[PDB]
Design a protein around this ligand. Structure first.
Ligand SMILES: C#CCN(c1ccc(C(=O)N[C@@H](CCC(=O)N[C@H](CCC(=O)O)C(=O)O)C(=O)O)cc1)[C@H]1CCc2cc3[nH]c(CO)nc(=O)c3cc21
Ligand SMILES: C#CCN(c1ccc(C(=O)N[C@@H](CCC(=O)N[C@H](CCC(=O)O)C(=O)O)C(=O)O)cc1)[C@H]1CCc2cc3[nH]c(CO)nc(=O)c3cc21
Ligand SMILES: O=C1CCN([C@H]2C[C@H](O)[C@@H](COP(=O)(O)O)O2)C(=O)N1
Ligand SMILES: O=c1ccn([C@H]2C[C@H](O)[C@@H](COP(=O)(O)O)O2)c(=O)[nH]1
Ligand SMILES: [Mg+2]
Ligand SMILES: [Mg+2]
Lengths: 264, 264
């Protein structure tokens, strides 16, 4: 997609070489923002084929508050495999913080339910926020939340969402991150009888891995195809009652998939 | 400053008329980013005189984990008066989260100390993060955190910082928010023997109050002057040992101050 390729090029042009936790090395910029008007189409990267089924199942999984990968494995989704322990656990990552953020009282806050209620009851609120950045639980997590903090906004009957992503593997992660949040916005907008507005993506450490460079140069040579259209085939009774079969992506005409290794 | 006036003008032009918590009424946009290279000058707004005394005191007060306005009152800094209870308490707002984020353990995490330790010891970390957004404490706070989430980055000997601000009163708050985080970066840079890099400001609900409209037109009519330069007079033993007297601003030649009422 145009903004995605622009970002990729910017990292090449303006990124600094920078070592990384994984061992591999990156070109990195700090601070970036892109906007996707979800009325223009569903922002699924077309310059390579993305594994939408993994994106859909992963979001459904977050929404269930699940942090054991058994569900992903039941649906043949492997993107979380490297960080799961022997029992399939990842610790209290996104799903847990989204549905059951823990507090001293032995209490738990369902941020997704809260945000739904704000959207329905108080859409003008300026604190329609979900955070996965539970400082007190970070060391229990297999991996620190990357898509850390997001906020919704309503105007002119349209639901917008801004994500703050602290760290972004532009080649592997970002297409998943964009589509996942774009999908959540549609779902939430459906539940709240709103139209979809913008997804605003904001990045912190935004990088290309040194061993994704061939892939990146290949992708940059490709022309973006028109955005597909997301169809939701029914209206589940709540944001928690969706199933994989509810979604169809129409007119997704991507260029071929490009293989690249995840830096563990 | 050019980027500040540009934003102000953007809100006026593109902003949606929207109701708000305080009942004042606003023009609002969602999602905006600005970048200040702190090497170019200290980003203290020049198209009106800004009260750096209040910015410094609030920051020292944050860093002490203090959440009672008593220290602010003592130095005649009155910005928080509207929200304190009788005993001067604001509840567990920024200072408490920054210094003593309580965990479900009887434990307290000091995020400022962790960030310094990260900067000194693991500067390439992509999770040098402070969050004020403690979901389980929000109901006890006098005000939900505005400047909610921030992240540091180190490249080329320079410390950059990105703030995610969920809600931003562009006329009153933003100039303080910008200066406050710019000052913080300088202090952090100093305490980590780094230079200053960029301050990246990212906004969620970014707005102008209907009753700051005369003030905004005044300010928009004024040409920015050169940015001032921050002087720190000594180097304290830690990030926690700074005193209001440590700070001089040189070459600040603002247009006259512009009065505006806060929306309580
Ligand atoms: C954003 C996001 C969701 N995640 C992903 C997403 C995609 C991937 C991934 O490896 N994608 C590849 C493979 C996708 C995939 O599973 N494809 C199936 C399986 C193919 C295969 O087995 O390789 C298929 O094509 O049939 C791709 O997009 O081509 C890995 C983690 C998270 C899980 C934890 C994680 C660690 C990550 N670490 C790193 C460091 O390189 N980068 C990430 O982007 C990254 C992303 C994630
Ligand atoms: C960003 C920030 C820090 N804050 C401020 C900062 C400044 C102000 C403010 O009223 N500033 C005025 C006065 C600044 C000031 O301290 N002036 C005194 C004036 C004398 C006095 O009255 O004491 C002086 O120069 O000495 C101004 O910049 O023109 C209010 C809150 C926070 C504290 C809680 C808060 C609520 C806020 N509410 C609202 C809704 O309109 N907007 C905010 O920007 C806002 C900002 C804040
Ligand atoms: O540091 C700050 C504090 C908060 N504000 C403004 C933003 C809002 O206009 C107001 C907080 O109101 P709410 O968003 O919670 O409804 O204060 C700001 O601009 N900077
Ligand atoms: O949703 C995600 C999760 C992770 N990453 C990438 C960013 C980094 O390359 C890596 C995580 O490494 P750290 O930032 O935690 O070091 O995975 C993403 O792009 N999106
Ligand atoms: Mg894999
Ligand atoms: Mg005042």
């Amino acid at each position: 997609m145009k903004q995605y390729l622009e970002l990729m090029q910017k990292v090449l042009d303006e990124g600094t070489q920078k070592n990384d936790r994984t061992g591999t090395g990156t070109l990195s910029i700090f601070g970036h923002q892109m906007r996707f008007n979800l009325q223009d189409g569903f922002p699924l990267v077309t310059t390579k084929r993305c594994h939408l089924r993994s994106i859909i199942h992963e979001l459904l999984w977050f929404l269930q508050g699940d942090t054991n990968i058994a569900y992903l494995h039941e649906n043949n989704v492997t993107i979380w495999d490297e960080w799961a322990d022997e029992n399939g656990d990842l610790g209290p990552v996104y799903g847990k913080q989204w549905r059951a953020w823990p507090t001293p009282d032995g209490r738990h806050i369902d941020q997704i339910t809260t945000v739904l209620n704000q959207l329905k009851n108080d859409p003008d609120s300026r604190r329609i926020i979900v955070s996965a950045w539970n400082v007190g639980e970070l060391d229990k997590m297999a991996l620190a939340p990357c898509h850390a903090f997001f906020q919704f906004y309503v105007a002119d009957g349209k639901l917008s969402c801004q994500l703050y992503q602290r760290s972004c593997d532009v080649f592997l992660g970002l297409p998943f991150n964009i589509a996942s949040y774009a999908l959540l916005v549609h779902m939430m907008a459906q539940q709240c009888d709103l139209e979809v507005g913008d997804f605003v993506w904001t990045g912190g450490d935004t990088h290309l891995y040194s061993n994704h460079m061939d892939q990146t140069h290949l992708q940059l040579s490709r022309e973006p195809r028109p955005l597909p259209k997301l169809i939701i085939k029914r209206k589940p009774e709540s944001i928690f009652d969706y199933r994989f079969e509810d979604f169809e992506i129409e007119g997704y005409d991507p260029h071929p998939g490009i293989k690249a290794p995840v830096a563990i």
